[PDB]
DNA sequence: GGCTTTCGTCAACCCTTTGCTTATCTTCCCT
């Protein structure tokens, strides 16, 4: 069931987000749902304390069912009901914490803004799925939560093999020339 | 009429290779633009653009995994757990020998400009890495375009960063056209209402998600226009090249 | 009354060492620097894990990165620089109330002993853990502000008094207690012997190919910079039941040995830091410990 | 009440041999040393294999690295440097409780017998593994601290008492029971005969393309340090039904015979160090086995 | 009334194994 799951999520801490500083630091717990970047194939992350939640008859938590066949966009555009839109949006909140997060200065013209860079969840999940699908092996793989990533993030709880990030090494200069 | 100061062979180790969540490796142009505005603050020489190239760069780790850092128990209140190993948050480290070239405008002799840049670099930190060594910086000027290329070829040997733009998104074209992605800036999500836990209480703060552009590495001599390698702070809370998209 | 600490108070690292490039030289020609190359060998042995008597009988094959001296050079040279940076009390994330009252309780830190133990950890060869043993003769050459010193025999587990390390410590304590920076270019000449195996930094990396993967820099054996930073700050002989110097940690915690010597007995960095801020008369040795933590830096969550 | 071992309790190795370069000399011209080159020869024979007798008539072409003495020098020389380091009880990764109680339970260990068997394994030529067969005389020159020690005829399966191996082993046991280090510059002169084929270590290779690939250092035939270290610690005559000395493993396990001489019958090393830590008095050769494991090194936890 | 310590709570993977680029060079001319 799906409503059962959305409410299982809500009895708990109940956060649905597209960006978070939880990937940068597991002690951080800042979860941000941006509205503008939600599209047809936008992967969407969610947080529960210790990734809690019941499974269905096929053994999947809410993170699997909300992320295949564009189900989160289907609930987001209300093809399955406007009261479900409400349930989804009740979990879609912006919780903020700046501790254990990077804080840099970016020039905004005759002044600076303290930007706190938090990582995009759609980038992590969709990039891991795509670069494993499209055989792109110029990459690093990192398990984010540590030994037991369920305290981090539902995607870190389920994708235990590690997230794919880009190997951004430049070409070297050969010294003997 | 353009003026540059070049610091060649900037051996830096301990570089925070975590450029973003999905990019680990060479520090992006936001890092070197931040280094440029850092000297605009400490030394007072106001910097328009920085062209940076990689002589050497190795991410610490294997070809598929980075070497994680053994964390130290430095938070408050978790004594008693300090005997066990500290939990590791992901921060890859790297070493890199760089060549930096700062567009500056200066009105004094080149010796005091070199001394000011040297005194900055002796107290600087490239991407969170201690600057292990660096050659004596030298001043070169770009009066014309041939002189611009003289400055360009004075960074030999280094692989500078040229912007090649975003067609659809980052993953698609990184597989298709095989270019490298890096942070060209950030996107502001929400205003931050709590300035207590920040560096300044008066500087306005935003949560950010890093936007990326797609870039290529070309040797500085093989770059036709040096403006396509000089990154500078654009007015879209991003950074950009002076020459635009490399073609 | 009761000035609380900032939640995310942070300090920058003030002892910044570089990566220790390992070269191969002779005791005769110490100018014949030759990059000790990280080689890769494959190892046949017996698997002997605590719970493996059933599989003890079978073999165990591991590919391991090794680093040995070549058989024509008997001396391991270690290259790094150490940059001591001033402004050790300028917090970059903590506010100007707790950190400044922290600072003004710490001018009475005797920086001379801190600098003496830092330069003695540099000079005695503490940054050379498993290859300072088995060395026939160590020799540390420290070059700073175009002036050069040499140390032959310094015992590493205690800080005995010599005028040369104290003479370097004068300018190091002048930088640390004051402003600016100072840089010591360190040359370790370690007479290990002909073809003796050297010990670079091993990496904390998930590697399917290499069971043991060493740290290389262009293939050349090298040691991690934070490893040498842990070596230089290994000055803490002031914890409870102090026998050997441990690294300056906020909790005095060697997770390598599984023991935290300053945790739970009210002598960690945070209790002494709150005592220094809130006007409690801090001891000289606790003062030097808090100052050494501020020199090391760190973020302090709470 | 039971003191469990630390999960990451590990001991560094204390016998550190170098890679043993092989040269060619004469029994008289030991000053004329020419490096034994590793050549590569393509060799055709029968298919053999225990199964598949249908393809017995087909040939078998394998390319094999060989190492032979030249036909002008009849003596194989093997050079290596054994570094016995001390502090064998300080675990580098487990220092604390268990490790230190093992130390106090192993203070009265007969280090003289362990050092005697180590120096005898160096002196009798056991580090030569398959080179010894066909050698008419094996003369070992061990130079300790500028101390030439000549050995001519020592049987290998038993440790018969002599005065020169014991003379070296006095200060080797002084190093092992105490601190410091000692270096043994070992040369093996073996009258193998004119043009005799010598047997270096062979690399483990999975990419194949060459059936036997010998260990080489710049082309010169050499032996792996691990093989020499296995032969030095081949001192274990204290297992159940002990007939020949075996190498010291935690499980008493050699992998050619596919057995474990000390697993499954409560004299593997983990049970003995658990007994010695928990106040169960070991016998003398039991303590010598546990201390020989600590001298060998390894990791004992989990 | 927080507050700091330690113990209990909640989990579960599908992996792949080098190039990225690839270096700053002589015609006229007259002194």
CSV table of C-alpha atoms in Angstrom, one decimal, chain A residues 2-124:
chain,number,residue,atom,x,y,z
A,2,UNK,CA,1.1,3.6,-0.6
A,3,UNK,CA,-0.9,5.7,1.8
A,4,UNK,CA,0.0,3.2,4.5
A,5,UNK,CA,3.6,4.0,3.7
A,6,UNK,CA,3.3,7.7,3.6
A,7,UNK,CA,1.7,7.7,7.0
A,8,UNK,CA,4.2,5.2,8.3
A,9,UNK,CA,6.7,7.9,7.3
A,10,UNK,CA,4.7,10.7,9.0
A,11,UNK,CA,4.4,8.9,12.4
A,12,UNK,CA,8.2,9.1,12.3
A,13,UNK,CA,10.4,12.2,11.6
A,14,UNK,CA,9.0,12.4,8.1
A,15,UNK,CA,11.2,14.4,5.8
A,16,UNK,CA,11.3,14.2,2.0
A,17,UNK,CA,14.1,16.2,0.3
A,18,UNK,CA,16.0,16.7,-2.9
A,19,UNK,CA,19.1,18.3,-1.4
A,20,UNK,CA,20.9,17.6,1.9
A,21,UNK,CA,24.0,18.1,3.9
A,22,UNK,CA,23.5,14.6,5.3
A,23,UNK,CA,25.8,13.2,2.6
A,24,UNK,CA,28.6,15.6,3.5
A,25,UNK,CA,28.3,14.7,7.2
A,26,UNK,CA,26.1,12.1,8.8
A,27,UNK,CA,26.0,14.1,12.0
A,28,UNK,CA,24.5,17.1,10.1
A,29,UNK,CA,20.8,16.3,9.4
A,30,UNK,CA,19.8,19.2,7.2
A,31,UNK,CA,17.2,18.2,4.6
A,32,UNK,CA,16.0,20.5,1.9
A,33,UNK,CA,13.2,19.9,-0.7
A,34,UNK,CA,13.6,22.2,-3.7
A,35,UNK,CA,10.3,22.5,-5.7
A,36,UNK,CA,11.7,23.8,-9.0
A,37,UNK,CA,13.9,20.8,-9.9
A,38,UNK,CA,11.1,18.2,-9.6
A,39,UNK,CA,10.6,16.7,-13.0
A,40,UNK,CA,9.5,13.5,-14.7
A,41,UNK,CA,12.7,11.5,-13.8
A,42,UNK,CA,13.8,13.4,-10.7
A,43,UNK,CA,15.0,10.9,-8.1
A,44,UNK,CA,13.9,12.0,-4.6
A,45,UNK,CA,15.4,11.2,-1.3
A,46,UNK,CA,13.8,10.8,2.1
A,47,UNK,CA,15.0,10.6,5.8
A,48,UNK,CA,13.8,8.6,8.8
A,49,UNK,CA,15.5,8.1,12.1
A,50,UNK,CA,17.7,4.9,11.5
A,51,UNK,CA,15.8,4.5,8.1
A,52,UNK,CA,12.8,3.1,9.9
A,53,UNK,CA,9.6,2.0,8.1
A,54,UNK,CA,7.7,-1.1,7.2
A,55,UNK,CA,8.1,-3.1,4.0
A,56,UNK,CA,5.5,-4.3,1.5
A,57,UNK,CA,4.7,-7.8,0.3
A,58,UNK,CA,7.6,-7.5,-2.2
A,59,UNK,CA,10.0,-6.5,0.6
A,60,UNK,CA,10.5,-2.8,-0.4
A,61,UNK,CA,10.4,0.3,1.8
A,62,UNK,CA,8.9,3.6,0.7
A,63,UNK,CA,12.1,4.5,-1.1
A,64,UNK,CA,11.8,1.8,-3.8
A,65,UNK,CA,8.2,2.4,-4.5
A,66,UNK,CA,8.4,6.2,-4.6
A,67,UNK,CA,11.3,6.0,-7.1
A,68,UNK,CA,10.3,3.6,-9.9
A,69,UNK,CA,7.9,4.4,-12.8
A,70,UNK,CA,8.0,8.1,-11.8
A,71,UNK,CA,5.8,7.4,-8.8
A,72,UNK,CA,6.9,10.5,-6.9
A,73,UNK,CA,6.0,12.7,-9.9
A,74,UNK,CA,2.7,10.9,-10.2
A,75,UNK,CA,1.8,11.7,-6.5
A,76,UNK,CA,3.4,15.2,-7.1
A,77,UNK,CA,1.1,15.9,-10.1
A,78,UNK,CA,-1.9,14.2,-8.3
A,79,UNK,CA,-2.8,11.5,-10.7
A,80,UNK,CA,-3.4,9.3,-7.7
A,81,UNK,CA,-5.4,11.9,-5.7
A,82,UNK,CA,-5.2,15.4,-4.2
A,83,UNK,CA,-5.4,14.2,-0.6
A,84,UNK,CA,-2.4,12.1,-1.4
A,85,UNK,CA,-0.7,15.3,-2.8
A,86,UNK,CA,-1.3,16.7,0.7
A,87,UNK,CA,0.2,13.6,2.4
A,88,UNK,CA,3.2,13.8,0.2
A,89,UNK,CA,3.7,17.5,0.8
A,90,UNK,CA,3.2,17.0,4.6
A,91,UNK,CA,6.5,15.0,4.4
A,92,UNK,CA,8.1,17.4,2.0
A,93,UNK,CA,9.5,20.0,4.4
A,94,UNK,CA,12.7,22.1,4.7
A,95,UNK,CA,14.6,21.3,7.9
A,96,UNK,CA,17.8,23.3,8.4
A,97,UNK,CA,21.1,22.8,10.2
A,98,UNK,CA,24.4,24.4,9.4
A,99,UNK,CA,26.6,22.6,11.9
A,100,UNK,CA,29.3,20.2,10.5
A,101,UNK,CA,28.7,21.7,7.0
A,102,UNK,CA,31.1,23.7,4.8
A,103,UNK,CA,30.6,27.5,4.8
A,104,UNK,CA,32.4,29.4,2.0
A,105,UNK,CA,32.2,32.9,0.7
A,106,UNK,CA,30.9,33.5,-2.9
A,107,UNK,CA,31.2,36.9,-4.5
A,108,UNK,CA,27.8,38.4,-5.4
A,109,UNK,CA,29.0,41.8,-6.6
A,110,UNK,CA,30.6,44.3,-4.1
A,111,UNK,CA,29.9,41.8,-1.3
A,112,UNK,CA,29.9,38.2,-0.4
A,113,UNK,CA,27.3,35.5,0.5
A,114,UNK,CA,28.1,32.7,2.9
A,115,UNK,CA,27.1,29.7,0.8
A,116,UNK,CA,26.6,26.3,2.5
A,117,UNK,CA,26.9,23.7,-0.2
A,118,UNK,CA,24.6,20.7,0.3
A,119,UNK,CA,24.6,17.9,-2.2
A,120,UNK,CA,21.8,17.1,-4.7
A,121,UNK,CA,20.1,13.8,-3.9
A,122,UNK,CA,18.8,13.4,-7.5
A,123,UNK,CA,22.4,13.8,-8.7
A,124,UNK,CA,23.6,11.0,-6.4
